[PDB]
Amino acid sequence: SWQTYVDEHLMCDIDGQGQQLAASAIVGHDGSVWAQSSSFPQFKPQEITGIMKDFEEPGHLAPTGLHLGGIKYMVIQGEAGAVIRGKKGSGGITIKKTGQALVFGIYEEPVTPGQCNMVVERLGDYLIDQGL
């Protein structure tokens, strides 16, 4: 199906298989969902607007926190205009910007930052190399 293909060939695939602890998504710059893991949260349009703004001005979200699905993440050091990172509890969030889209990964213990980040980098490079 489309969603098994998404869960298998694209989104964070942490053992379970697909245990609820890790989730990822590809979201257009305009806030439309291109693909998301079965566990990925619903999010609000203005959360995407604020994230896009932080890619233009890194640290835009730091005083208020970064919100996704209503959850507040503390902004940490990222890569200006390319990657946003945030922490919450035992996990966090990584967002990579591509030409037309954003790649999200959300993780919690025992999923590690490195595990999630490897998937987010992989999907972002795949999109960028397709021209997206």
Numbering used by the authors: 2 to 133
Paper lines:
Bet v 2 is a plant profilin panallergen, i.e., it is ubiquitously distributed throughout nature and shares a highly conserved amino acid sequence of up to 75% even between distantly-related organisms. Both structures share a central six-stranded antiparallel β-sheet with two N- and the C-terminal α-helices flanking the sheet at one side and a third helix flanking the sheet on the opposite side.
While the overall structure was conserved between these two forms, the crystal structures revealed marked differences near the N- and C-terminal segments, which are linked by the disulfide bridge Cys13-Cys117. In the oxidized form, the N-terminal segment is disulfide linked to the C-terminal helix, which adopts a strained conformation enforced by the disulfide bond. The poly-l-proline binding sites of Bet v 2 map onto the immediate neighborhood of the Cys13-Cys117 disulfide bond, providing a direct link between the differences in proline binding with the differences in the crystal structures of both Bet v 2 forms. Hence, the apparent higher binding ability to poly-l-proline of the oxidized Bet v 2 can be explained by the conformational selection principle: the likelihood for the ligand to find the receptor in a conformation suitable for binding is increased if the conformational space of the receptor is restricted by a disulfide bridge. In this work, we showed that cathepsin S degrades the reduced form of Bet v 2 rapidly, whereas the processing of the oxidized form is sufficiently retarded. Given the significantly higher proteolytic resistance of oxidized Bet v 2, we suggest that this form is the sensitizing allergen.
